[PDB]
């Protein structure tokens, strides 16, 4: 009476649920927590109105072997810290014009719906506040 | 002037001009005349009479005007891979001649030069379109043809 | 009007009409009876029973919903990167009403003939659409996958 | 050993008792691919052990 | 069991031409009150709400509330094959996985029964409170399309002001800045629509003009468009289709970074 | 010496705007009866039979029987250089390599000349033996073109079934199928226009779609079209153009396997 | 301080679309006589000499000679905002890096203040002397663009030979050969379509097609065109834009390579 695979039935919903790679998990969680803090401070500055020392780079890269848990750790950290993942897989046509003109505004503009069921993380294809976060999955796969 | 080779000149235009194989020639003629021609796998050393056998069979089945439209002959060494199985072979096997109703013939000479994936698709082309067309594979080595493709043919 | 070959006239229609590979065929039998089959790859020599067991398992799982819940692709089909991106993903996102425990099935026969780029483009499709769609692949050389 | 105990945990949630050595052989067979071991564990447990 | 008989196919054709390149998939939340479509962008920064009343259809009938998710390329390439003045039945069963469009007499000779396979997806809820706004303005829709297209060549961002003096459109880029002013006493002669304002306090915001050109493709749906703005809530572009319903666009403003003074 | 001057250049534009993508080479047979075009598709699945009578031509002179094999892409490029109400004249010699198109002035001062080389080729000489058909209907051509271009969006192969009621079109694809039924009773602006039924046994077959679209690309040639098919003989559509020619496309049915599964 | 007024935007839009691809940047020099534009293309084979007289402007004000040069992508993107009828203000200061376009809309009060930045081109004034031209032709523009598209589809190389009865167009290429003949037709109802011949000697010359197509892009600028051909001089095309000025297109001919003897 179950319709779910055991990978997504037992998917880690918390960064403490993943097995191994604790230093990499802590690094990614600290980076995403700093980004969430920057987003909340931006919201506070907006409310008030109406970077070598920080060294917060705009992009992390994650590498390792197949099936170790890179995507699972990314999704668990973004779920814990309230991010919304916009995923670009190799399983959809991602050429430069389409990915720019259909996902740049996720980074550059606010979320129109910030509360509700928006914690669900969608994908990209073309045939409490939640901060946007892009995830390019399997960047080495270039067609 | 013209001095044509004796290989071409003394060719068995009819199935009765072959000299050595007589059991399988009788079997092939009996496949022809009761309208039960299967997929064939003519294999052996060169110069034995496989191409001559299939050309006499196609002359027995089709005519001169419909020879250029009902039987298609390929050499797999000219272009290997599935760019020719998914392509001329698939479109030939899946289409139908407008007024000519019957069955088509594919003569795939030098089938052992075909790659493994091209054979893996040619077997499926054979399976899906058995009634529309028959396939005759001519080769030297049976060890260079996958058993799945061998088993569809006699 | 012709005599069907005995490989098709006597082709098995159930999972108990398959001789050899008793453990794996038994596991496929209990999965076909109970449901919720995972994404499987069946590797072996030619003529073993892989396509037969995959088709019988899909038939026993689906039943009358075979014509709408099953998408089968051989090596004679295209199965390219663009086919994986449009047709496979469109069938995976397609709504098909099925009894609980039964999923839509994408059968990829002769997975050795699939290009490496198409297999790379089919990686996430095997993952996200796993609550509605399952993948059953048959292959001879598992190293080509 | 960490992945072996993790798989033992997910098997014990399914009311199965398994030894560490068999899971260690499976994990050193598939080179600690966690998802592959999870999926093969699902296939093997749900088919009766 | 559900039937919805659109009086003219031009309504659905213009709707799907409005949502064509902006929305990825269309979800219809259908009940006894009518037809609702709250679909967000692929980037999830712009939301399209479309409400069609039950009385606006030629004949409307429902049995239970249900949601249908259809791909938009397929629905668009099917609605491009529909008669403009002809009547269109939309039809679906209780729990089936298909949606039929019956075009009766597109060329006065044939009946057409097109079918679409529905998709399945987690239907997010977009019910937002109807808070008051600070700056509403009645201005024409053909003019909105014209000036949005016109300033769209200059750059990629819109700097928009609403105050008592009117609506201000600034577009700065490598080409050079361009400014657009709207006046209350100003009235067009193309359609004779006069600008009126019910403003509360001045607001400065900035958006992406590409999604504004995507929004303005619904110009033939209504003669006039109402723009609503305030400091916190997103931009609202409203078309009121007479006896049909209303189509609103919610566009969030761009994030701006305060400089380190 | 061959010299054929037409009443209008529009009919030559419309007759062969459909053969640009379907016909690889146009073979034209010139005799005292008229102009013949019996061409074969490169996949040997479609045939085009076109007959131009001497009565329909403004002028027609011919001393011998000619077989002229011409390319389509460049010739379509030069007939993109033609009007509608004007007059064209085709001139060729007995043993030359030219195709002289004399182009009467649309502006009454601009007389044009076009020369094309002649590509010699063997002729299959496939004459249609002109069987009888068990399912014949008449249908207005614009509707058939609309229906074919509509079903091209859905799938790649259509099922055409003719019976005692009328022509039924089906197309099952990935997006979901689409069905069309034609009823005998038809009410249009004209007094007399309907689907007719003259049939012996109902026949249902399956056909490729690009070839059917290329067949329907010549719909402004004639007002009506005639569809004839039966169980063994292929599909044929026939455009009997007004008092100057007839045209006749044969399409063979495709081989299906999901019917028997 | 530049203050120029274009009474109609149609001429400015059409002259922009005429040289949109033809030349890289427009360099305007301004005197008390009016507006002048002497611009050379990227390949340095074509010259544009355009003169707007001052009385064609409703208001004109120029304190000093004003020379500036600005790219044409921004121009192509700024007069795409001009309507088919409106009044336009070209505004500039005595010494700045910004040119302003002010559109007064058909609205009662809606200004378009579009200020673009300069980039300070360094160009030279290539003064061309006036001389005797052996052949002058009066020719309508639309059908001349039709001849340009006629010979475009045949071959890139264009040949024009002026004979005692008029002009002859020839295109020889891979596909074949195309010829277009014009006779003396000065006796017609309207003086526009009359092709008057006041030539002295026959001349035949070869020119390209891309820059020719860029020249025929100015078809709606005026009803009629003056064609000027003499020995060892560039092709001259004259547009007489009524009540405001005249435009000249110069194309350096392709030099035919003579074979050795
Ligand atoms: N460290 C882990 N802890 C718990 N579950 C894991 C772990 N690694 C993998 N999984 C499971 O495996 C599933 C898929 O793992 P992924 O994170 O997608 O693998 P990956 O690191 O992305 O490598 P790729 O994408 O296949 S190359 C997850 O949904 C989990 O169920
Ligand atoms: N059984 C035979 N009887 C008479 N002549 C034969 C016979 N077999 C071959 N020949 C002669 O050999 C010539 C060429 O034989 P082919 O049948 O073309 O060789 P093949 O069987 O095609 O071998 P490969 O593998 O294709 S090179 C013919 O033209 C005949 O002259
Ligand atoms: N285990 C088996 N039990 C009974 N019949 C079998 C078995 N394996 C094969 N057959 C027969 O062989 C025919 C073809 O076998 P398939 O299972 O279709 O081929 P396969 O096992 O998929 O191997 P490949 O790699 O596809 S060639 C079937 O239709 C059966 O008639
Ligand atoms: Mg991953
Ligand atoms: Mg041979
Ligand atoms: Mg098989």
User: From residue F47, how far is each of A83, F205, F222, G39 by CA, in Å?
Assistant: 61, 18, 19, 57
Residues touching ligand 3 (Cβ under 6 Å) are B 148; C 7, 10-12, 18-20, 46-52, 138, 140
Say if residue C80 carries a ligand binding annotation: no
> Between β-strands F100-103 and F168-171, what pairing exists: parallel, antiparallel or unpaired?
unpaired
Expressed in angstroms, the distance from the first to the final Cα of chain D is: 21
| Cα–Cα dist E230/E45, whole Å | 17
| Cα–Cα dist B119/B86, whole Å | 11
Structure tokens that stand for A41 in this block? 């401070």
Structure tokens that stand for G245 in this block? 């000025």
User: From residue E205, how far is each of A48, E140, E163, E208 by CA, in Å?
Assistant: 16, 21, 12, 11
> Between β-strands B133-139 and B40-43, what pairing exists: parallel, antiparallel or unpaired?
parallel
Q: Which residue CA neighbors atom 15 of ligand 2 most closely?
A: B47
Task: Tell me whether residues E182 and G117 touch, CB distance under 8 A.
Answer: no
- For an interface test with G, the pick among F74, F78, F112 (most G C-beta atoms closer than 10 Å) comes out as F112
Residue B139 belongs to domain with CATH number: 3.40.50.300
Angle at B102 between CA B97 and CA B107, to 5 degrees: 80
Angle at E187 between CA E183 and CA E192, to 5 degrees: 155
DSSP 8-state class, residue B99: S
Question: What domains can be seen in chain E, in order of their start residue?
Answer: 1-256 (3.70.10.10)
Structure tokens that stand for E22 in this block? 């902006």
Q: Are G100 and G117 in contact (CB under 8 A)?
A: no
For E58-183, where are the alpha helices, taking DSSP H only?
72-79, 141-152
D5 strand-pairing partners: none
| Cα–Cα dist C33/B16, whole Å | 59
Closest CA to G26 of G14, G6, G40: G40
- Which ligand 2 atom sits closest to the C-alpha of B6? 31
Task: Tell me whether residues G80 and E179 touch, CB distance under 8 A.
Answer: no
Expressed in angstroms, the distance from the first to the final Cα of chain A is: 40
Resolution (angstroms) stands at 3.0
> Does the beta carbon of C93 lie under 8 angstroms from any beta carbon of chain E?
yes
Residues touching ligand 2 (Cβ under 6 Å) are B 7-8, 10-12, 18-20, 46-52, 138, 140
At F36, which helix (H) or strand (E)? Answer: strand F34-40
At F61, which helix (H) or strand (E)? Answer: strand F59-62
Task: Tell me whether residues F110 and G180 touch, CB distance under 8 A.
Answer: yes
DSSP D1-49: -HHHHHHHHHHHHTT----HHHHHHHHHHTTT-HHHHHHHHHHHHHTT-
User: From residue E105, how far is each of E88, F154, F216 by CA, in Å?
Assistant: 10, 19, 20
Q: How many CA atoms lie within 13 A of F125 on its CB side?
A: 5
Q: Which CATH number fits domain C2-145: 3.40.50.970, 3.20.20.20, 3.30.160.60, 3.40.50.300?
A: 3.40.50.300
Distance A8 CA to ligand 1 centre (A): 9
Residue E197 region, left (φ>0) first, then alpha (ψ -120 to 50), else beta? beta
Total domain count, chain B: 1
Residues 6+ apart with CB under 8 A from C3: B36
Say if residue A107 carries a ligand binding annotation: no
Contacts 24+ apart (CB under 8 A), B28-32: B28/B53, B28/B57, B32/B57, B32/B60, B32/B61
Structure tokens that stand for C121 in this block? 């483009």
At C41, which helix (H) or strand (E)? Answer: strand C40-43
Residue F227 CB coordination number (10 Å): 19
Q: Which residue CA neighbors atom 18 of ligand 1 most closely?
A: A71
Q: Is residue G142 exposed (0-12), middle (13-18) or buried (19+ Cβ within 10 Å)?
A: exposed
For residue B93, give its domain range: 3-154
Handedness of CA B127, B131, B133, B139 (dihedral sign): positive
Structure determination technique employed: cryo-EM
Angle at B115 between CA B110 and CA B118, to 5 degrees: 100
* Ligand lying closest to the C-alpha of residue B138: 2
Residue F73 CB coordination number (10 Å): 10
Task: Tell me whether residues B82 and C7 touch, CB distance under 8 A.
Answer: no
Which residue has tokens 């099925």?
C98
At E28, which helix (H) or strand (E)? Answer: strand E25-30
Query: Which SS3 state, helix, strand or coil, does residue A4 take?
Result: coil
Evaluate whether chains A and E are touching (3 or more beta carbon pairs less than 8 Å apart): yes
DSSP A18-69: S-S-HHHHHHHHHHHHHHHHHHHHHHHHHHHH--TTT---S------STTSS
- In E54-109, DSSP assigns E strands to 59-62, 66-71, 88-92, 98-104
Distance B51 CA to ligand 2 centre (A): 7
Q: Are A36 and A82 in contact (CB under 8 A)?
A: yes
User: From residue E162, how far is each of D19, E135, E203, E227, G124 by CA, in Å?
Assistant: 71, 6, 5, 10, 47
Q: Are B98 and F45 in contact (CB under 8 A)?
A: yes
User: From residue E103, how far is each of B145, E6, E77, E109, F172 by CA, in Å?
Assistant: 55, 10, 14, 11, 18
| Cα–Cα dist B92/C76, whole Å | 13
Distance C109 CA to ligand 6 centre (A): 7
Distance F154 CA to ligand 3 centre (A): 36
Q: Which residue CA neighbors atom 17 of ligand 3 most closely?
A: C49
At F180, which helix (H) or strand (E)? Answer: strand F178-182
| Cα–Cα dist F122/F56, whole Å | 29
Q: Are G162 and G204 in contact (CB under 8 A)?
A: yes
Domain ranges of chain C: 2-145
Q: Across the interface, which of E151, E176, E186 has its CB nearest the CB of G116?
A: E176
| Cα–Cα dist B111/B144, whole Å | 8
| Cα–Cα dist F50/F127, whole Å | 12
> Does the beta carbon of B128 lie under 8 angstroms from any beta carbon of chain C?
yes
Task: Tell me whether residues C27 and D48 touch, CB distance under 8 A.
Answer: yes
- In G54-132, DSSP assigns E strands to 60-61, 66-71, 87-92, 98-104, 111-117
Q: Which residues surround ligand 6, an ion (CB under 5 A)?
A: C 51
Q: Which residue CA neighbors atom 14 of ligand 3 most closely?
A: C47
Task: Tell me whether residues E119 and C95 touch, CB distance under 8 A.
Answer: yes
| Cα–Cα dist G249/G227, whole Å | 10
């Amino acid at each position: 009476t179950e319709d779910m695979l055991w990978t997504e039935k037992y998917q880690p919903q918390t960064a403490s649920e993943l097995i191994g790679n604790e230093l990499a998990i802590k690094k990614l969680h600290s980076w995403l927590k700093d980004w969430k803090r920057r987003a909340e401070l931006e919201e506070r500055q907006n409310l008030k109105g109406k970077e070598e020392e920080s060294r917060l780079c705009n992009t992390v890269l994650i590498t390792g072997p197949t099936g170790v848990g890179k995507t699972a750790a990314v999704y668990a950290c973004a779920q814990e810290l309230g991010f919304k993942i916009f995923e670009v897989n190799a399983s959809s046509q991602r050429s430069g014009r389409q990915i720019l003109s259909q996902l740049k505004e996720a980074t550059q503009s606010h979320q129109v719906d910030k509360q509700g069921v928006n914690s669900q993380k969608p994908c990209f294809f073309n045939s409490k506040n939640a901060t946007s976060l892009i995830l390019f999955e399997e960047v080495d796969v270039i067609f | 002037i013209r001095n044509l080779p004796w290989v071409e000149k003394y060719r068995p235009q009819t199935l009765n001009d072959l000299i050595s194989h007589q059991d399988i020639l009788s079997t092939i003629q009996k496949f022809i005349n009761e309208d039960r021609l299967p997929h064939l796998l003519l294999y052996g050393p060169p110069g034995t009479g496989k191409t001559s056998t299939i050309l006499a069979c196609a002359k027995q089945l089709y005519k001169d005007k419909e020879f250029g439209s009902m039987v298609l002959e390929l050499n797999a060494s000219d272009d290997r891979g599935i760019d020719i199985i998914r392509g001329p072979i698939l479109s030939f096997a899946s289409t139908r001649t407008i007024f000519k109703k019957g069955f088509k013939l594919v003569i795939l000479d030098e089938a052992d030069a075909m790659t493994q994936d091209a054979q893996n698709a040619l077997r499926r082309v054979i399976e899906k379109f058995t009634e529309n067309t028959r396939f005759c594979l001519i080769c030297n080595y049976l060890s260079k043809i996958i058993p799945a493709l061998q088993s569809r043919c006699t | 009007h012709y005599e069907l070959p005995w490989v098709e006239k006597y082709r098995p229609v159930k999972l108990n009409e398959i001789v050899g590979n008793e453990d794996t065929v038994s596991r496929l039998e209990v999965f076909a009876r109970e449901g919720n089959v995972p994404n499987i790859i069946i590797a072996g020599p030619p003529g073993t029973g892989k396509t037969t067991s995959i088709l019988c398992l899909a038939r026993a799982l689906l039943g009358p919903a075979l014509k709408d819940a099953m998408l089968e692709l051989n090596a004679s089909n295209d199965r390219g990167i663009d086919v994986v991106r449009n047709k496979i993903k469109m069938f995976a996102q397609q709504k098909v009403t099925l009894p609980k425990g039964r999923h839509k099935i994408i059968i990829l026969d002769e997975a050795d003939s699939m290009t490496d780029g198409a297999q790379q483009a089919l990686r996430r499709t095997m993952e996200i659409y796993s609550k509605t769609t399952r993948f059953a692949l048959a292959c001879n050389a598992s190293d080509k996958i | 050993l960490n992945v072996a105990s993790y798989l033992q945990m997910i098997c014990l949630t399914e009311n199965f008792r398994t030894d560490v050595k068999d899971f260690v052989t499976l994990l050193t067979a598939n080179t600690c691919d966690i998802r592959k071991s999870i999926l093969y564990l699902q296939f093997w447990i749900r088919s009766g052990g | 069991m559900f039937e919805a008989r659109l009086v003219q196919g031009s309504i659905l054709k213009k709707v799907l031409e409005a949502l064509k390149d902006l929305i990825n998939e269309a979800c219809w939340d259908i009940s006894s009150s009518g037809v609702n479509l709250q679909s967000m962008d692929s980037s999830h920064v712009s939301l399209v709400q479309l409400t069609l009343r039950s009385e606006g259809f030629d004949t409307y009938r429902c049995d239970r509330n249900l949601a249908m998710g259809v791909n938009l390329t397929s629905m668009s390439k099917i609605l491009k094959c529909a008669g403009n003045e002809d009547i269109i039945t939309l039809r679906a069963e209780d729990n089936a996985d298909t949606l039929a469009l019956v075009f009766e007499a597109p060329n006065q000779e044939k009946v057409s029964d097109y079918e679409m396979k529905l998709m399945d997806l987690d239907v997010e809820q977009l019910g937002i409170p109807e808070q008051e706004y600070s700056c509403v303005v009645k201005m024409p829709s053909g003019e909105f399309a014209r000036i949005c297209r016109d300033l769209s060549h200059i750059g990629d961002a819109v700097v928009i002001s609403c105050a008592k003096d009117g609506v201000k459109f600034s577009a700065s880029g490598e080409l050079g800045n361009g400014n657009i002013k709207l006046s209350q006493t100003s009235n067009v002669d193309k359609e004779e629509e006069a600008v009126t304002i019910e403003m509360n306090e001045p607001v400065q915001l900035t958006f992406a003009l590409r999604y504004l050109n995507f929004f303005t493709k619904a110009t033939p749906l209504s003669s006039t468009v109402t723009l609503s703005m305030s400091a916190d809530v997103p931009l609202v572009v409203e078309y009121k289709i007479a006896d049909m319903g209303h189509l609103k666009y919610y566009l969030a403003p761009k994030i701006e970074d305060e400089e380190g003074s």
